[PDB]
Amino acid sequence: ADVPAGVTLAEKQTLVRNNGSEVQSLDPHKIEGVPESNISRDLFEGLLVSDLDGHPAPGVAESWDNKDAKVWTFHLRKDAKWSDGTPVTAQDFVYSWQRSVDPNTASPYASYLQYGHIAGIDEILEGKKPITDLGVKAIDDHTLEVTLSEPVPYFYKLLVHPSTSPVPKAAIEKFGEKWTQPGNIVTNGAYTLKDWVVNERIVLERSPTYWNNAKTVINQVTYLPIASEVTDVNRYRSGEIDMTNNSMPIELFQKLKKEIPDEVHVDPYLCTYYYEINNQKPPFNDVRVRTALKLGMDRDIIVNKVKAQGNMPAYGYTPPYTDGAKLTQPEWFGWSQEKRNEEAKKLLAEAGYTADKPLTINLLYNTSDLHKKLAIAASSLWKKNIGVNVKLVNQEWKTFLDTRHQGTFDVARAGWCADYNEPTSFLNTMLSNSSMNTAHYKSPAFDSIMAETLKVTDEAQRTALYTKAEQQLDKDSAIVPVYYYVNARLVKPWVGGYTGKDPLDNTYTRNMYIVKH
C-alpha cells in the first residue's frame, strides 16, 4: 500500500469483504471466476501484478526484457519467499506453468498461456506432447526464460493472471487435493490462509515472509460468501461488511446512489454488450443492412431507461479504457438518434426495404431476465426507429453457443469480456480464422491491420493500428455495439487504496488501508 501524505491510519487494520459466493478452490490451477480470483491474488503472486491503474508492475520479477518479442527473460527478485520461508525460484515457475497446461490438471484456465504462444503449448494442451516440452526454462534460480513460437509484444501483460501464479510442488505432492487446507498450504502472496469455514468465512492473515510486507497495511482480511445481494448491502449498512461484492439489482442501486453516492463505486470493466450480426447470411452480408441495424439501436434508451446502472453507450468493440487503446468516436455516434434513424432508413431503402416491404430479422438470445428484457427493448426500438420487424428466439447456453458457431442465426445477443488488459483480447476474436469469430466476419484489411500490430516495435504505432482495426470493424458494421460494462460496489469511506481505475478489477488487499474514523 502507498498511504498518502497526511492520512491517519486506524489502530485496527482489518477488512471484511463480501465475495459473493462460496469459493470451491484456493488452488490457482483449479480456480475459475472472480470470487476465486480475488482470494488467489492475496495468497499467490506471479511474475507481475496489476498496479492501482491496472497497468503491469513488478511482482516476483523485479525486471524483464525480450528479444524480438519472442524470447522473454524475467529477472526474479532474490528475496521472494514462500510462507515456510523458502525461496521462490525460477524452477517454481517452470513446474507451475507445466502443471497449468497439463490436461491431467484439467485447469479451467489451461489454455490461458496460449494467448502467449509459448513454444510447444498447442500440442501439450491436446495431450499429444509432454508438459516438459513447454518453452519455459530456469536459466538459474532467479532467471526465467520463456520462448514463444511467434512474436507477442504484450506477453508480459498476461502474467498478472492468477492462473500464471506459482504453486508449491512439495505441498501438492505431499497432500494432493488437501494441499490448500489451512494446515498444509504454502503461499507467496501478501497474505496466508488462517481459517476456512465452509459457508461462513475465509480469513487471511498478513504474511511476514512476503518480500514487500513492509508496505502491507491490512493485517487481516475476511471474505464472506453471501449470494443474496440485498443481504450483502444490509450487512454493509449495519457495519459488519466494509466492501460488498460487485453486484446489485438496479432499484437498490438507484436508492443507494441517492443516500450514499460516494460509497457506491461504479467502475468501468472490460466487457462489451453487443448484438452479433451473422455477416455470412443474406441479407446480413449487405453492409447497408448491418449499418442500418447499428444506427437504429438507441444506446441512450438502453442505458438510461432500460438499465440505469451507469453502463456507458458503446460505439465500438474494444472498450476505450482498455490499456493500449486510444479510440476515435465515429461521426455517427455524435449525431442525434433521429438523424441516425433517417440515415438508417435511407440505407435500408437502397437495399430494397421500404415501408411497404420491410426487413424482418430474428434475434437470438440465451434464456435470461436481463437478456430477454434487453431483447424486447431492442426489438421495440428497431421496429419504431427504422421500420425493422424482429422475432425473438431463445435457446439454452450449450445450444445458443453451438447455433452461433454453426451460423444458424440472423443476429445474436452477445457479450465479450477481456481475459487481459490489452486491445488484442477483443480484436483477435474478429480475425477471419479465429475459432471465436461467431460474427463470421472475414475482412482481409482487418486481418492485415492486426498482423502488422505484431511487427511494429513502437507502442504509439501499435496503438494507432488498433484504432485503425476498430475503424475497419465499424466501417464494415460487423456488429451492433450497445454498451461497455461497469461493476458497482459499496466501499466504506474509511477504506483507502481502492481507486476503481483497473478495468479488470484486479485488486489486492496489500494495496488497501483503514483510515481512522
Please list the residues that pair with 481 across neighbouring strands: 274
Residues 6+ apart with CB under 8 A from 191: 42, 43, 204, 205, 206, 207, 210, 221, 509, 510
User: What's the rounded Cα separation, in Å, for the pair 139 and 141?
Assistant: 7
Supply φ then ψ for residue 186, to 5 degrees: -125, 130
Query: 79: which 3 cell numbers?
Result: 528475496
Which of 416, 418, 420 has the alpha carbon at shortest distance from 159?
Answer: 420
Ordered by start, the domain boundaries in the chain are 1-44+169-270+487-517, 45-168, 271-486
Pairing of strands 201-206, 220-224: antiparallel
Helix (H) or strand (E) segment spanning residue 191: strand 191-197
What are the distances in angstroms from CA 91 to CA 48, 94, 136, 189? 16, 5, 9, 17
Please classify residue 111 by burial: count the beta carbons closer than 10 Å to its beta carbon, then call 0-12 exposed, 13-18 middle and 19+ buried. middle
Q: Helices 369-386 & 287-296, crossing angle to 10 degrees?
A: 110
Beta strand 14-18 with 220-224 is parallel
Give the whole-angstrom CA distance, residue 469 versus residue 318: 10
Q: Taking a C-beta distance cutoff of 8 angstroms, is the pair 180, 27 a contact? A: yes
Q: With left for phi above 0 and alpha for psi between -120 and 50, is residue 100 left, alpha or beta?
A: alpha
The DSSP bridge partners found for residue 315 are none
d(CA 495, CA 31): 27
Return the closest-CA partner of residue 478 out of 318, 353, 368. 318
Show Cβ contacts of residue 494 under 8 Å, excluding neighbours closer than 6 positions. Answer: 10, 514, 515, 516, 517
CB 140 within 8 A of CB 116: no
For the domain 45-168, what is the CATH code? 3.90.76.10
Please name the residues in contact with 464: beta carbons below 8 A apart, sequence gap of 6 or more.
Answer: 326
Q: Which helix (H) or strand (E) holds 338?
A: helix 337-350
Distance of CA 30 to the CA centre of its chain: 18
Q: Can you read off the three cell numbers belonging to residue 136?
A: 519455459
Q: Taking the CA of residue 11 as centre, how many other CA atoms within 13 Å lie in the half-sphere pointing to its CB?
A: 0
Q: Grid coordinates standing for 232?
A: 450483502
DSSP secondary-structure letter at 249? -
Per the CB < 8 A criterion, the answer to whether 193 and 202 are in contact is yes
H or E stretch covering 487: strand 479-490
Contact 333, 315 (CB under 8 A): yes
CA distance 326 to 429: 19
Dist. CA 74–CA 90, nearest whole Å: 9
Range 1-44+169-270+487-517 has CATH code 3.40.190.10 = yes
Nine-digit cell string for 282: 443474406
Instruction: Name beta bridge partners: 57.
Output: 49
3-state secondary structure 415-454: EEECCCCCCHHHHHHHCCCCCCCCCCCCCHHHHHHHHHHC
Nearest Cα to Cα of residue 132 among 156, 99, 168, 162: 99
The two domains 45-168 and 271-486 share their CATH topology (first three levels equal): no
CATH homologous superfamily of 271-486 equals Dipeptide-binding Protein; Domain 3 (3.10.105.10)
